[PDB]
Structure formats: structure tokens, C-alpha cells
Design a protein around this nucleic acid. Sequence first.
RNA 1: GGCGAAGGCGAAAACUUAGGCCAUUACUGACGCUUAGGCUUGAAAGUGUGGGGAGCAAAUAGGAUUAGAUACCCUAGUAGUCCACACCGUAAACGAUAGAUACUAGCUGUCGGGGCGAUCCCCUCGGUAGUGAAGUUAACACAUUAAGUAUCUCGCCUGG
Lengths: 65, 141, 240, 83, 167, 53
Amino acid sequence: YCRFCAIGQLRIDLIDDLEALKRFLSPYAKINPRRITGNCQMHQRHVAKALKRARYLALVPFVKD
Amino acid sequence: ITTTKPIKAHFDPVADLLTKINNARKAKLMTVTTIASKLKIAILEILVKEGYLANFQVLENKSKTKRIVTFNLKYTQRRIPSINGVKQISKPGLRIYRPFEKLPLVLNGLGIAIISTSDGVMTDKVARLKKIGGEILAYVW
Amino acid sequence: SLAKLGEMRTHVGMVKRYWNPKMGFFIEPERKHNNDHFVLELQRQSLQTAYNYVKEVAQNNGQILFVGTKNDYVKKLVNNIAKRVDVAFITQRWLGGTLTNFKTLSISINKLNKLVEKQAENAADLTKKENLMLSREIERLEKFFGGVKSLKRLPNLLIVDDPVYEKNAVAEANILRIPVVALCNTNTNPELVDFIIPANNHQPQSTCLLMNLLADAVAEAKAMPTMFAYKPDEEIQIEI
Amino acid sequence: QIDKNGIIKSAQLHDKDVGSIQVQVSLLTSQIKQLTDHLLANKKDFISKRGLYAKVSKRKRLLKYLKHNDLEAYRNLVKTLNL
Amino acid sequence: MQYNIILLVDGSLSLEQANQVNEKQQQTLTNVEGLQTEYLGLKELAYPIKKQLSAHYYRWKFSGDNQSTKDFKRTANINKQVLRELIINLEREYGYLASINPKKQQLALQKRAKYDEIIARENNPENPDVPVTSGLASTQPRLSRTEKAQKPKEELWDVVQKMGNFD
Amino acid sequence: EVKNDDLELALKKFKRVSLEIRRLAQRHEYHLRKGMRLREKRKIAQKKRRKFR
RNA sequence: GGCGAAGGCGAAAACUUAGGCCAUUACUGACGCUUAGGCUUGAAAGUGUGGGGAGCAAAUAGGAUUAGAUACCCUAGUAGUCCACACCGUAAACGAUAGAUACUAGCUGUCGGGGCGAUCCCCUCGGUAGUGAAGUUAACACAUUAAGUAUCUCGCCUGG
């Protein structure tokens, strides 16, 4: 099942989506592309910015997981 | 009629006029619609007089809020268009004025060459009869 | 009857939106749900006109070719027609040099007749494997030239399962500029037939309808039997 | 910041115009003021001076228009500030 | 442009110390200091920032144009107790339109209907139904009226017809 | 990356994550230009998109 | 996939900022494009100043092949990478397709925008593409994102 642009709230930056990010990014430190979760240009860019900001938040480690 | 969509040009009716005309020429379109001007109405009326045209209507929104002309391309029962070549001779950047002594036919005589001499667009043979010359607008055959 | 609504049935579903828009000239706005429809007034008027045209054409003792090589349906239809008629027919789709020339067909059909005589004669003259080989090769010859053995002049009229499908048939038919009737869908262009009759072929219901109507239009030319030309009642059958 | 619509509505010399030649050239001038304190705040952004040239050429063309087509529509102009 | 300080305190220490550090940080505003405490709870930090694996997240609303963003960022990078000093803003590029605002309930109706307890499941995630009720077609309103129509004949082109009667 | 699964097949699961780490880090071990970096990355991406999917 | 003039742009935060996408009945009213003039950037190499240089590497030193290695191969290192400064001006700066320009089959899309519902399948306009009609090409093929076809301007060539 597609994950964003399929249940997407159109606003994915930091709003209580920590568990989703920990499931969107598997514990093996990889951001999912549009090729699996199916997120659109909008959703994918916002998820990318949010996840790299969480990396710059230590919520998700840069290189560890 | 109801169009509910604008029609655009470059800066003058000649551009989009001939754009759509040649679009019908190559892509084989049944009907065309472009913006309205004196030249188009006059040429459509004169080809009606010479017997060369399908249905054609001038459309206005109120008086100038949109002025357009629509016209079908006339084909036959076997879908052969009556026009066997249409090309403008005068262009906005290329305007040619010829006296009545210099008004030829199309190829040999195959079409009608329309000249605006001194009061409007009218045909070559009677232009020389009236011995008044002017703009040879285009070649249609 | 002819041009009556009782014939046509189950005209739903086409290919998946892979087509050219020329059909839009002669067919109502296509349905975007992959299921393009063909309003039946145009189909019935075209059926009437085509029926009369090919009936007049075949009344002149012209030769007809009943070739349809679809998966199984039009093949079985033309085979049933063939076992019903004396006019030539081909079970399969040919390969080249059929309507663009007769020299290529000449040697093939002459050796077809020669091998027919051989199989009527050769039962102990050769070896067992060679005899089985001759049997299989005469089967191969007959599957492509089952009707060529019954004509010398090329057919003056023909039908096709789908003009796009038999590319060779339409190609060598269009080498010269000749009339033809066929079944056409939303996918193809109207230049593949000189009098278009657009409808469905994906459901077999419409396919057999149009094919039997076309066959029976020329059926009553040489005082020959008919199953669907003027019957007000129709039979619902599936892909055979 | 941008000061586009505020300066348009403030300087609407006609009854209601947000895209008249007057208000459009005022828009362009206000925007070049904003882009000038850009290039003061961001010097290496030369795209801003490129757009500055673009808009000033457009407005001078628009002013030549405002002079030649409507003979006195450029008389009430108080823009295209100090040179 | 209004901004939002996401402020942190050293590890999981006492909340009173967290509030004291929060007030100390909030004493350094330039414009009007109208702000409120929004305790976002204790959230972890997978890797150390200033030797704290977790931090008490606080939210603060303040108003400026560009005054107290870089200053707060730098002075909290220097600040030992503040691990992260996030500056958020209402600049958040997504639709604020009235054709997504009721649909926000529909967004809830996504999750509300992503699960459905029944003997025979009647719902599927992203199942095409075509419930489309209205549309715009992005069309520009314009009418017209015919002015003068001469030679109004458009020839009724016959059906596809070539090389007809055999005779 | 947690690999605490079993006492005998941990390395088998370690193989795939190591392969992913390699394929994301197979370009930082040599000198090269930006053009060939983008070329190889995008070409491999659109080649995997066409064959495996 | 988007944006940006090509030049290019991706750990984040923020700063200012513009272009832009749809719908604007509308806001005006022929300002519409144009290049010689005039106005800016133009990668990187490289030039120079100061720091700074974790790192490696033009030239170079040595080891290897070699007929030799200015080669492939390796250990160092100079500028070379960085920061700011200015210069630098050529590029596969390649639509190998000038700008804008006006519409032109289908087709699967894909993204953004506007009306819709649960995101979705829906219509539309623009951004991202070609299979291919017509048209145009020496052929591939451009082809709805023209090399189709109207309008203007300009630069670029007449075989080596």
C-alpha cells in the first residue's frame, strides 16, 4: 500500500509523526523513496526535509540508524 | 455561441490567423476558430462571393470583450478539401503593393488572386477592368 | 432483419486506452473506463450499406476470400462458413506473396495439389517416416492454402477478422487500390476499410454478429444457404 | 517587505486598478527597492541585479508607451525615482 | 513574521530547572515578549548533542521579522543546557485552501476508515470508487453572440466512401 | 542496526544490510568528477527501474 | 521530480528574496518580441591577498611496466580542496534545435495548481517524455514539451 499521497496529511514536518518516521525509515538507516511508499513530489520533499531536520534533531541518527 | 475560452495572438491577427490556417492545412482539421479582424471578415466574404468557403460566423462578447471568427474547412463527400493550397503573400513585415498592371493569376490561372486596390479587397480580373491596383493579399488555389 | 436493433448484443469493453482518435469522427465519445461503446444507429446503417454493397459485388460471380485468423473465434466462424460454402477459404494467416503476385502462390498451390495426389497414392512407395513427413507437410500446405486450391483468379472480395491483425492481408490488398469490408474498432483508423462498420470484437457476441452478417451478405449471391441475414431472432454464443 | 499590493491600493490614481501601467511601474519600482536592500543584504545574488535590469528595462518601455499612446498618462507619474 | 522556539534542557532533569532555563532563554527577546509555555514532553535524542541522550521539549511563540532567530540560535549553541534551539515559523509550504479544510475531516476519515471492524470488511485503503460529485474544469467564464452569418452551409460529409459500385 | 535474531543465522541477515551499506557507499573511495558521479548514479537508477521493476 | 538564465541547485535551522502553478467574471489596456547599443552572470581550471588546509592530488621525487613511462600501478608532496575577497570567461555553457511566439492527432503518464472524495480513481491548465499520425528530415527521427506551422528581430556559415 502507498504510504503518502495515499493517507498523507499534506503537512509532514514534525507533527507527532515520530513513530511514522521510525517506520518510514527502517531501523537500518535508509529513507524510503517514492518507489516504495509512493509519496508524491510534495510529500516526498516534505518528508525528506523533515527527516534530515530530525537528523539535525538527533531524533533519528545521521549514520547509526 | 458559448466558447468560454480566450484566443491568443502574437501581436496581430495575421500570426495566429495563419497559424490556425496552416494547422488545418497540415493536420486536416474540419473547423477552425481565431480572433476577429476586418481582413478575415473581408476575405471570408469575398471567398463566399467567389464560392470557396464553408460556414463562417463572427462572434463578439458584448462589443469588444472578445471578437473572434469561426469557420469550417469545406471538404467533400469523400473528404477532399476544396482548397488546393493557401498561402499569404503579404506579411506584417513583408507588405507588397502592386498596380493593376501587375496583377497575375495563381500558378497559371488555377486560383483567385485578391487585391485591395482603393476601397476594399476585390478580384484581379475586374480590378484591371476598373484599372485600380493595390495589395495582392494572398494566393489560394 | 437488417439494420434492426435486435441483432446487436453485449458491446462492452475494448483494449486499455491504446488507440488513435480517428474513430472519434464516426463513433460517439469513447468511454474513459476502457469500455468504449459504439452507438448502434451508425453500426446498423453501416451494416445495411455494407450488406447491400457486398451482395451486389458478389452477385457478379466474383470470388470471395473468407479469412479470419483470430485466437479461436473468427477462425471457427470462417471454418463453419467454409464447411457450409463452396467458396475458397484459408484456415490460417499467410506469409507473403499472396495478393501482390500469383507466381508465389502458383508453385505453392501446384505442389499442394501434387502432394494431395501423392497422399492419395503414396502409401507404400516411400518409408514410414517419409510418409508421415509428407502427411504433415501436406497438412501444413492445406492450412495456408485450403481455398487457393479452388481458385485461379484472385478474389474480387474478402473479409478479415481485424485489418490490423492480418497485416499481410491488408498490405497486399492495398498494393492495389481495391474495395474491402472488415470489422474495425476504436483502436484502428478508418483508412483500413473503404466502408467502415465500427463495433466490438472483444466480446464474441458482437464479433460473430458482424462476421456472420458479412458472410451472409454475399451468401445469397450464388443461391447459397444462410444463418444470419434477415432473422429477427439471434443466438447468444461465447468464444468457440 | 514586498510592499506590492499596499502601494498599489495606496497609489490607485484610477477608480480601481492593480495592473494599470501606473500601478505596474510603481510595483516594479517598489520591487527594485526591495531587491536593492536584497543586494545590500545578499551581494553574491547577482540574479537580483539581473532581474533589476529586466524590470527597469520593462518599466522604461512601459513609460515610453505611457508617453506615446496616451499623450498625458505619464504626466501624473511620480515614480522612476531619483537617478 | 511569527516564530516558534523549540527549546531543550539538559537530559531528563527536574522540570523546575527546565522552566528556570526556559525563562532565562525567554528573557532575551527583542520585540514584544508575548509568549507561553507549551511543554512538548520528554523526547529522546539518539546521539549526543551536549552530552544528553534526551531533553524536555518546550514550545514558545514570539513575534518579529528577523530579529531573534540567529541570535537565539547562536546563543543556544553556546548555551550548555539547551541542546537544540529549533526556530519554526508559519512558513510551512502546504495548502491552506478551503478545498482541503473540510477535507481535513476527510483526512481523519482516512484513518477512521483505514480500520473497520465488521464480519466482512467493506473498506480498502485507496480503493477507486469515483465518488466525484462536482467539478470546475478550470475554465474561464466568457460568452458570445453571433453577429452576422453568411454562407452558413457546412457540407454533410458522407460516410467513408471510395471506389464504390463494382459495375 | 540490530542483528540480535538467532545464534547461527545472524550473518545471513548481516549480508543484506552490508550490501545496502556498500551500494550506498560504493562511490566515496576514489577521486572522480561530479558529472560522472551523477551520470553513473542516475543511469544505474533508471536501469534498475526498467529491469527489476 | 521540482526549481533556477544556460551556467546549476540536496545534513539541517533561520535570514531576505524572486520567479512561478491554476483558477482571477477579473486590474489596466497593444506596454506584446527582438538583437547590433546599452545592461549582468557564466562552471571549473587557473591569478593574487590573508588566514586556514582534515584530506588528497598538475607539475615533481621514488618505486613498477617499458625500447623509454611525460602511462596504466602505487608511497609522498607544490599549487591544487576551504573561508572571504576580487579576477578569471572558455565549456559536451548541447533543444547539439536563438528568443518569444500561435495553435496542431492519439497515447501512457507524471507533478503542481483550481473544483471532488478517503488519500484514490474525475475534468481542466500549466511543468516533467517519448512510442507514433499529419507535417518536416540524408536516416534516426522532432511530433503536443517541434525539426509542424503563422509574426518580428538578431547573431551564427558558405569546402578543406
